[PDB]
């Protein structure tokens, strides 16, 4: 069944003030690259959401490990390393990400068994 | 599987204004009071839609009951009470909830058995 | 288990001023319409979305024919037809859609056997 599910919304511009956590791939990806960069940090923190969402009333237990790949068409798709791969090691992750204006958002889903 | 799930969005501002169907806990939790008080609104009505949703062409069958309880770490969680935990007596809720400059959102997804 | 989650915003005003892919059933729920047309449009990207992520490296294989009817009390259903109807045979969707202020969002989960 479902472990979690996360929102984020994420400001573009104010997101691209601070930023001035990615995979070179990400910013090989992003690169108007606030736009794309915010969006993955939404699905980062969506990610984050789900999983931490799943561990209510539980001590909690990052960025740069959950990677958004896209493929060729641009589909995203979420890839774990480092520790919180280990804790997510069964864990199907579905993900989703938007950008329009000044707004990123994205929304993930874990699934287990 | 999946009962329904729900999103919504909600401009703080505006519901500032307009609250000028909340627990303790939640009034507790939120007192910069809006922007949290708009992101649990959006939470359940994010329940409803998921949960009425899965009725469709059916005659309709409530915010106070919808709770988002949150945990010494701030994750949220509904918790059901009145005629609503009654009607989704075996169902688990899944929210996330989200608040960026003047916009709060929320999404749900209902699992059943 | 879940196929794919898509999530998509649109603004508003500039969805209307873009429109002037839609069913007579659409159109006449919408008529104030660029609101109820722009989160349909939302719908119908978050379905693509959701069924196109889960085809990840694999070549894409459309909006008329993600139909969002809606019951007398308002609520949302997507119906198939043509090709993507055939694709999508045994798979469930739900969807959820939202529109506040300047912007609309939809959200849907594909789920299969
Ligand atoms: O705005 P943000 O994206 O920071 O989201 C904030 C929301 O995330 C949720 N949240 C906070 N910590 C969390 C965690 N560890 N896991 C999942 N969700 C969490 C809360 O609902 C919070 O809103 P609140 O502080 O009004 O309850
Ligand atoms: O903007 P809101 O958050 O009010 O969301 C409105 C949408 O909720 C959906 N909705 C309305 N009633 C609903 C219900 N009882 N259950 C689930 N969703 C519903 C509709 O898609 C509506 O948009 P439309 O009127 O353009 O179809
Ligand atoms: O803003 P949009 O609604 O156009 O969403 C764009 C996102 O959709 C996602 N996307 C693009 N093509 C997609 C497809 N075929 N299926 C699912 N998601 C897709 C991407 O994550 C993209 O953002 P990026 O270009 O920053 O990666
Ligand atoms: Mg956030
Ligand atoms: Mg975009
Ligand atoms: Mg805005
Ligand atoms: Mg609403
Ligand atoms: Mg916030
Ligand atoms: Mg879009
Ligand atoms: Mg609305």
Redesign the pocket.
Same mark, same amino acid.
């Given at each position: 069944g479902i472990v %979690?599910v996360?929102?984020?919304?994420?400001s573009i511009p104010d997101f691209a003030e601070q930023v001035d956590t990615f995979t070179p791939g990400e910013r090989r990806d992003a690169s108007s690259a606030a736009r794309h960069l915010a969006a993955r940090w939404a699905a980062k923190?969506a990610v984050?959401?789900?999983?931490? %969402?799943s561990?209510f009333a539980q001590r909690?237990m990052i960025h740069r490990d959950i990677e958004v790949v896209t493929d060729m068409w641009g589909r995203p798709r979420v890839r774990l390393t480092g520790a919180i791969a280990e804790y997510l090691a069964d864990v199907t992750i579905h993900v989703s990400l938007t950008h329009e204006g000044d707004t990123a958002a994205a929304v993930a889903i874990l699934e287990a068994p």
């Open positions: %979690g996360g929102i984020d919304l994420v923190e984050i959401k789900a999983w931490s %969402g561990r909690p």
